[PDB]
């Protein structure tokens, strides 16, 4: 029937990612106005973003535990509940710690919801994991593009608190409704030889090489997500140009995931990782120079950088499922989400402080160096490292 079809659950996962896209990708544009009204330094609001992403490292493995053992329905229920709680009251904020706490709660919900959607995609498509991961990550990267006008129209017409409460209610209700339908391909759990547990995966050096590579890659991407608009203005760009640039970078970032997933399906995923990371390092090294050329040059740099960076969010979950089994995959990708959070530590507050004290060029140099490190690890270290033995 319909509920037995393989691609229906992929569509449900993409819908879930589309719903939760706004929580993370609406920040790129609204970080500066939130700083302006709160009257605090940019590092404060960037640290709020950092907290929202860091709590995901402790959240996503927790939800993945329940998803792996008992199924994804109840975990998705309470993840949607947490997202609803965080986003609904986000409008009535007038203090810095209130924003900190509410955004952290919303991020904690978003992390487990993302983990569930990606796990559903990967488990439902063992033969094509790159493509399913790419479609799901594309849903996560592109859902902000239609969502942002809707909340923006409500803010001008009805206000801030009403907009946040209404969008949070809609997202939570839709996530709860989707949690009724989604299911795993099986319908208990059986462990095979290729299934690595949490401790067994953490033991092998392959997992930590991948973790370090993901941590190094996410530096420039997350710093751009946090501070493209302030850096763009430091380049001397009008508000309209920066908004068009944010839309373009979001579009390229979202559209890259299916393409890089298809490449990772048709070629070794490690070689795709190496190519993507090398291109990202090249773009980040050249970013201050080409971006200083003009508006078109800056926006093109942004689009290429986000293309490369977002390519990895289909590369890594499929690699994790391929290498360390399928029955343990949700909480297994939670530990890579931990690397994402550890990189978001620099992507937000720490990178903002680095830019404040030494200029944006210093932070961009840091991102380029970390991207080169990740390129070195992916291209030369891990392809000859073999598969884990356990």
């Amino acid at each position: 029937g319909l509920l037995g079809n393989r691609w229906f659950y992929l569509v449900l996962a993409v819908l879930l990612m589309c719903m939760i896209s706004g929580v993370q990708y609406s920040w790129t544009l609204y970080a500066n106005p939130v700083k302006d009204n709160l009257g605090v330094s940019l590092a404060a609001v960037q640290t709020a973003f950092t907290l929202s992403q860091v709590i995901q490292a402790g959240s996503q493995p927790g939800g993945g535990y329940f998803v792996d053992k008992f199924g994804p329905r109840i975990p998705l229920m309470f993840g949607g509940a947490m997202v609803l709680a965080g986003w609904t009251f986000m409008g009535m904020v007038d203090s810095v710690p209130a924003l900190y706490a509410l955004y952290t709660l919303a991020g904690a919900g978003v992390g487990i919801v993302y983990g569930i959607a990606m796990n559903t995609a990967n488990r439902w498509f063992p033969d094509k994991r790159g493509l399913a991961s790419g479609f799901t990550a594309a849903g996560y990267g592109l859902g902000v593009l239609p969502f942002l006008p809707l909340i923006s129209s409500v803010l001008k017409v009805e206000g801030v608190g009403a907009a946040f409460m209404y969008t949070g209610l809609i997202m939570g209700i839709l996530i709860i409704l989707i949690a009724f339908v989604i299911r795993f391909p099986g319908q208990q759990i059986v462990v095979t030889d290729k299934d690595f547990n949490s401790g067994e995966m953490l033991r092998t050096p392959q997992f930590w090489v991948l973790w370090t590579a993901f941590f190094s890659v996410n530096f420039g991407g997350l710093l751009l997500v946090a501070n493209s608009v302030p850096y763009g203005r430091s380049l001397g760009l009008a508000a309209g140009v920066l908004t068009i640039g944010v839309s373009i970078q979001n579009l390229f970032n979202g559209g890259c995931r299916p393409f890089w997933g298809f490449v990772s399906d048709k070629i070794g995923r490690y070689k795709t990782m190496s190519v993507v990371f090398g291109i990202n390092a090249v773009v980040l090294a050249l970013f201050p120079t080409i971006a200083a050329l003009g508006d078109v040059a800056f926006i093109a740099m942004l689009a290429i950088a986000f293309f490369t960076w977002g390519g990895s969010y289909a590369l890594f979950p499929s690699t994790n499922s391929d290498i360390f089994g399928t029955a343990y995959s949700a909480r297994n990708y939670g530990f890579f989400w931990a690397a994402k959070a550890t990189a978001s530590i620099f992507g937000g507050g720490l990178g903002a402080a680095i830019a404040t004290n030494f200029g944006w060029n210093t932070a961009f140099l840091i991102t380029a160096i970390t991207s080169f490190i990740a390129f070195a690890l992916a291209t030369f270290v891990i392809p000859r490292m073999g598969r884990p033995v356990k």
Partner: antibody
Amino acid sequence: VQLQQSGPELVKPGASVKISCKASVNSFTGYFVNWVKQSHGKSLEWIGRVHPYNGNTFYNQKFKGRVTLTVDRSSTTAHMELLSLTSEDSAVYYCGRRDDYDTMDYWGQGTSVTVSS
Amino acid sequence: DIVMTQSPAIMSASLGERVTMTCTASSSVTSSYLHWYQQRPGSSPKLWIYSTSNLASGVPGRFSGRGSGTSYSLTISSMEAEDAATYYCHQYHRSPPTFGGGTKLEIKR
């Protein structure tokens, strides 16, 4: 985009001062209106800022409730009203358009207000 | 707040010379939130440099702006008669915004 203010003002101490600032067709598109003062042509210090649409007000602690900024709702003029005149209130007041980064793109010629018994 | 001191307060430079003035802040300022305004003696303040690097509309290219952290500098490659004015730096790292003490630039002869 151009900004025009009221003429010079002579006011006895303790009275009310009302300064107008006229704007162009859509000058306050995504901009606040910022009110700043210059003491004697040597020092700049911020008075306040107001949103031309929301009416949201942000004021310095120097002028806590002394000053009220109000936009005319046609996005054509903004008014600064001060009410606790003392000796150090004699200065020139400037209105400007202020984007999200506190950059004041365009200013007015200024309005010289003097308190004199 | 954040106190900004501009040095020197009054300076004299010969026509055609290279002019550099500095604006030091008490705390670190994010480079996107520090601007420079040039005020002629009889006229109103005019936007000159925004976000520490970029010149406003209708500004000659001889004007340069550098700086990061706690120190910022406005530089003129070749001094001109039209460049003689007062320069105010403007910070918005944290509310409330504050302005510098001003640098009075005069022409030597």
